[PDB]
Amino acid sequence: KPLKEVVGAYLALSDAQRQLVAGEYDEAAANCRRAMEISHTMPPEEAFDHAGFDAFCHAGLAEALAGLRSFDEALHSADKALHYFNRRGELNQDEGKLWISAVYSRALALDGLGRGAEAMPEFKKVVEMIEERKGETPGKERMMEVAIDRIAQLGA
């Protein structure tokens, strides 16, 4: 019973992560929600990092929803991930890649909702974090180009 749920949740999240890379955002969003649903069926006495795991799921979910241009839901998912990363996040660990992702998703969501005044500083934050982070950050070129193009278009 207990480990079945731990592995079930981990595999659901891994599937979602591969789907994000492949651009299958509909499936990725479903698997992120499914991963959390499974993680929350565990008894409280079983050792598991719920706070961190939920943050990872929300980051992935925010990226998927941003991809589908469902910005309102994306914004809320990114905020739930950032609530964790701002408190217990570590930028120079693998975890940091998902932190940056959540900040980027938030910027895209705010921009998609027509809240450019708030999106701008978030796009700047994405670039600042990429610089600050020691270690490979896959997709950094894509993010930085979007960030810089939007900061210019919103300013004009």
Automatic annotation (TrEMBL):
Location of the DUF3856 domain: 1-143
Name of a matching Pfam family: DUF3856
Annotated protein name in UniProt: DUF3856 domain-containing protein
Organism this protein belongs to: Chlorobaculum tepidum (strain ATCC 49652 / DSM 12025 / NBRC 103806 / TLS) (Chlorobium tepidum)
